[PDB]
Amino acid sequence: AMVLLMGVRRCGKSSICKVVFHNSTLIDLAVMELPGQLNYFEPSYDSERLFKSVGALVYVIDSQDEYINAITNLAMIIEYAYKVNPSINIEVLIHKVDGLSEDFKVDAQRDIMQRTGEELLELGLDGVQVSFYLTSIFDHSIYEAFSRIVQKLIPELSFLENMLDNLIQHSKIEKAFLFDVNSKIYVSTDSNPVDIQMYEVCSEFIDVTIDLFDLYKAPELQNVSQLANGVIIYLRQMIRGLALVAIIRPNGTDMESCLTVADYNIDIFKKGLEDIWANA
């Protein structure tokens, strides 16, 4: 599942790649940037194997600059991308939206959606669905957008959802995330809505864990962080680069008993995750 990053020059693809992936199917592989300038596309210039090897195509649109020509070039790209392979998920990111109001952001997203839909109607493409995400480097939005893009390329999503739901239901967990060690891209969660504040807490917990481990090296990552109100934050490294982060509430119980039952349940969950080849 190799995703391809496409966009105009100075839209922010390299900065996005650096911020996300520098700080296979599921691991954060070396993605491919592609500077696409305005030109006439050559018909079948040995690009069929390239687009057939892309799990999902990601397009970047700069909201600061004019984007009508960007949407036109995007439509030209989709015009052969959907023709070569009709199973490619197409994603569009509206980057650099940090200095915009909520109403302006929603209006811009609606205008971009309407323009893309009308241009695809003009080109005669049918049965194609394009997702849109409002992304920015300075906040959590790019992480959530890449999380959705990665989640669209894991065929075992619902089974992981059921497994995490059962784990949370039998361990008094508030919210459990199945992160990855790099890029902080959470892979699976429960049916509960992804709270932004809790996601940022878990991401900074991942950063603190990795940094503190890297400070003392050269002699399986586990971490328990308990707050003042009894709320604990748990960490346990899963198979390959996956890591499990959960927020467990005590509900007026013993701390050590809760830690023991959570450790046993999470070890059982890891043993179950060993059978499924969701890693790497």
Partner 1 sequence: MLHSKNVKGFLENTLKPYDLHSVDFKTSSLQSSMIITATNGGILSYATSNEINSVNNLKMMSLLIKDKWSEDENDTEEQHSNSCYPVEIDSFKTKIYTYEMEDLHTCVAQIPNSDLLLLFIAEGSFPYGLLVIKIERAMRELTDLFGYKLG
Partner 2 sequence: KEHEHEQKLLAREQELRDIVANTNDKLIDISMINNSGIVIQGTDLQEALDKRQQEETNTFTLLSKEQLKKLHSNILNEIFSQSQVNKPGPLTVPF
Ligand X SMILES: Nc1nc2c(ncn2[C@@H]2O[C@H](COP(=O)(O)OP(=O)(O)O)[C@@H](O)[C@H]2O)c(=O)[nH]1
User: Is residue 38 a contact residue for ligand X (CB under 6 A)?
Assistant: no
Which is nearest to 241 in space by CA: 166, 169, 183?
Answer: 183
User: Is residue 267 a contact residue for partner 1 (CB under 8 A)?
Assistant: yes
Find the part of the chain contacting partner 2 (CB under 8 A) among 54-62, 97-105, 240-248, 250-258: 250-258
Residue 14 binding result from partner 1, ligand X, partner 2, none, given CB thresholds of 5 to 8 Å by partner type: ligand X
Q: CA 210, CA 206: separation in Å to the nearest integer?
A: 6
User: Is residue 136 a contact residue for ligand X (CB under 6 A)?
Assistant: yes
User: Is residue 272 a contact residue for partner 1 (CB under 8 A)?
Assistant: no
- Quick note: the x/- pattern for ligand X over 72-101, rule CB under 6 A, is -----------------------xx-x---
Indicate the residue among 80 and 159 with the shorter CB distance to partner 2.
159
Q: Which are the contacts of 173, defined by CB distance < 8 A and separation ≥ 6?
A: 167, 246, 247, 248, 249, 262
User: Is residue 255 a contact residue for partner 2 (CB under 8 A)?
Assistant: no
Residue in this structure with the two tokens 């906040």, named with its chain if needed:
139
User: Is residue 137 a contact residue for ligand X (CB under 6 A)?
Assistant: yes
Q: Which are the contacts of 279, defined by CB distance < 8 A and separation ≥ 6?
A: 26, 238, 239, 240, 241, 242, 273
Which is nearest to 176 in space by CA: 269, 85, 98?
Answer: 269
183 marked among binding-site residues: no
Q: Which of 257, 272, 274, 280 is in the footprint of partner 1 by CB under 8 A?
A: 257
Q: CA 221, CA 243: separation in Å to the nearest integer?
A: 8
Q: What are phi and psi of 14, to 5 degrees?
A: -65, -40
H helix and E strand count, the chain = 8, 9
95 marked among binding-site residues: yes
Residues that bind ligand X (CB under 6 A): 9-15, 95-96, 98, 136-138
Residues that bind partner 2 (CB under 8 A): 156, 159, 162-163, 166-167, 169-170, 172, 253, 257-258, 261, 264-265, 268-269, 271-272, 275-276
Binding residue positions for GTP: 14-15, 95, 98
Binding residue positions: 14-15, 95, 98
